[PDB]
């Protein structure tokens, strides 16, 4: 189908300041933080948008931190309990009343192996859309 206009070409989510002591134990994590993607001006006949996710993963399968903090990975989910690790897809319906589509998502940091170290958190997840 014909494509929509990507409204949110870049989106940021700031996990803020996390604390090494709170991320010392294996399995520790931050709270979930929202982020969303939006498409607009969806042509008549286009009723579904599929987002395909990609980004650098580490040995836990989650997204790798590219910042200086060690032993931190990043988890992306949708709003329904599905993890969207690299290669995942998510499909949503176009809202005909507004000719728009949106993807409500959430991100957290977690330390699978424990012992997160001080430094920055930086990661980028890329999304390509297909239309049907």
């Amino acid at each position: 189908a014909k494509p929509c206009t990507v409204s949110t070409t870049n989106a940021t989510v700031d996990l803020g300041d996390l604390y090494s002591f709170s991320l010392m134990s294996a399995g520790a994590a931050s709270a979930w933080h929202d982020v969303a993607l939006e498409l607009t001006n969806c042509p008549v006949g286009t009723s579904r948008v599929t987002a395909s996710f990609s980004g650098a993963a580490d040995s836990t399968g989650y997204y790798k931190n590219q910042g200086t903090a060690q032993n931190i990975q990043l988890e992306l989910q949708d709003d329904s309990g599905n993890t969207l690790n690299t290669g995942a897809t998510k499909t949503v319906q176009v809202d005909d009343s507004s000719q728009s589509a949106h993807f409500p998502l959430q991100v957290r940091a977690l330390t699978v192996n424990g012992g997160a170290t001080q430094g920055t958190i930086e990661a980028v997840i890329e999304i390509t859309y297909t239309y049907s």
Binding site: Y19, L105, T128
Partner: peptide, 15 residues
């Protein structure tokens, strides 16, 4: 990429 999500934050040292 059509969109990019940038994740930011900082791990502070409190032991």
């Amino acid at each position: 990429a059509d969109s990019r999500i940038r994740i930011r934050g900082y791990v502070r040292n409190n032991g």
